[PDB]
């Protein structure tokens, strides 16, 4: 897929992703906080359409992500991120997608997720997260 | 004066300031780097005019500030920053302003200056710096 | 189980743990680096015995952990850490224990593990890791 790297910011305000109940995660875009000001990250779009959009609007700064989990699995011969779930100190958003394959999860005891990087083709190929105090 | 807080970024690309050989530092503006892209900070201007502008264009990212020094002193009854000097791993910029009063200096052995905050009325009242790895 | 928290240090030199191929991980002890000198962390032991000891001696500082993975699952009605694998830039240590249950993995792209905390009763109930640049 096409790689992307948003870099690191001050925090997260909103996450916009799309998924398909039969395949995996598609589009991915994040609205970060940049020193108190909303900063719209580039919209990382799938090469195809047919996804269901989801908007996760956080109550920044009181609400923040404490755990990210999901599943990676094979779809049409490609290993991709099939499902994602975001748990904040207030609610659980997801799971979005298909929870089949190999699970992974990143709980955070101290610190914050402040950025994302990865690759998206038909679906989200892989992703990493920037962490900071 | 009017307080300002640019916040923290990825690095520094250019500093624009102005000074008066008889008083102190006036205007202050920084062009930061934000995850590889230039980000123009707000111009923090003095309430008056008559200053000499100075542009410090750094060769980012190979060139970075290693020490900031200057002088604070009384000007018309106000304690302000009268002079500033920026030393990078490549050269020394300054001193700009009046080298009289109480000196101060911040040498950095490991780390980077990634942001500024302070206050400016007729002159730069005070300032602080964000540091990070 | 009894909680423990080694805290954060400047690096890792050696890891000593024990496991049982029919249950889970038992004992856990770490020799950390503390500003260039070895620092022996307290030995956190299981309430019972019968485990197989394993010593992981890293070639500090050229060798360091790049990924930690394992499995968590139910043993005797408790959710515990059943297996652990340590991958460095030079070799893969493990898996140690039973590779059954729910997998988890923490790949590190930039940063270092500098400490551990968790809880141990009959087995390692859970654990967390301190990360730093």
């Amino acid at each position: 897929g096409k790689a992307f790297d948003d870099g690191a910011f001050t925090g997260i305000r909103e996450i916009n992703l799309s998924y398909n109940k039969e395949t995996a995660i598609g589009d991915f875009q994040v609205v970060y906080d940049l020193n108190g000001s909303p900063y719209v990250g580039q919209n990382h779009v799938s090469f195809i359409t047919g996804f269901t959009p989801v908007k996760i609007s956080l109550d920044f700064p009181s609400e923040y992500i404490m755990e990210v989990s999901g599943y990676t699995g094979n779809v049409s011969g490609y290993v991709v991120v099939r499902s994602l779930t975001f748990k904040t100190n207030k609610k659980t958003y997801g799971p979005y997608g298909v929870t089949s394959g190999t699970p992974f999860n990143l709980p955070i005891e101290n610190g914050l997720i402040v950025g994302f990087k990865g690759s998206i083709g038909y679906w989200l190929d892989y992703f990493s997260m920037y962490l900071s105090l | 004066g009017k307080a300002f807080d640019d916040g923290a970024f990825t690095g520094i690309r250019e500093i624009n300031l102005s000074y008066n050989k008889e008083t102190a530092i006036g205007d202050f503006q920084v062009v930061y780097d934000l995850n590889g892209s230039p980000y123009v900070g707000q111009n923090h201007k003095s309430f008056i005019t008559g200053f000499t502008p100075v542009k410090i264009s750094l060769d980012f990212p190979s060139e970075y500030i290693m020490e900031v020094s200057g002088y604070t002193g009384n000007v018309s009854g106000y304690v302000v920053v009268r002079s500033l000097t920026f030393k990078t791993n490549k050269k020394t910029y300054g001193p700009y302003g009046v080298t009289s009063g109480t000196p101060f200096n911040l040498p950095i052995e490991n780390g980077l200056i990634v942001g500024f905050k302070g206050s400016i009325g007729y002159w730069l009242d005070y300032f602080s710096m964000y540091l990070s790895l | 189980g009894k909680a423990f928290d080694d805290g954060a240090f400047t690096g890792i030199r050696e890891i000593n743990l024990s496991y049982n191929k029919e249950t889970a991980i038992g004992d856990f002890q770490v020799v950390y680096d503390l500003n260039g000198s070895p620092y022996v962390g307290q030995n956190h032991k299981s309430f019972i015995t019968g485990f197989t000891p394993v010593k992981i001696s890293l070639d500090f500082p050229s060798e360091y952990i790049m990924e930690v993975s394992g499995y968590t699952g139910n043993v005797s009605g408790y959710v515990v850490v059943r297996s652990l694998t340590f991958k460095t830039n030079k070799k893969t240590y493990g898996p140690y224990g039973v590779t059954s249950g729910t997998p988890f993995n923490l790949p590190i792209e930039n940063g270092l593990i500098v400490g551990f905390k968790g809880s141990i009763g009959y087995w390692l109930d859970y654990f967390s890791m301190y990360l730093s640049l």
Partner: peptide, 16 residues
């Protein structure tokens, strides 16, 4: 060493 600030990065999860 460099004039670029760094941050801890964990991952990636998904295709290798």
């Amino acid at each position: 060493q460099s004039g670029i600030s760094q941050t801890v990065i964990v991952g990636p999860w998904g295709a290798k």
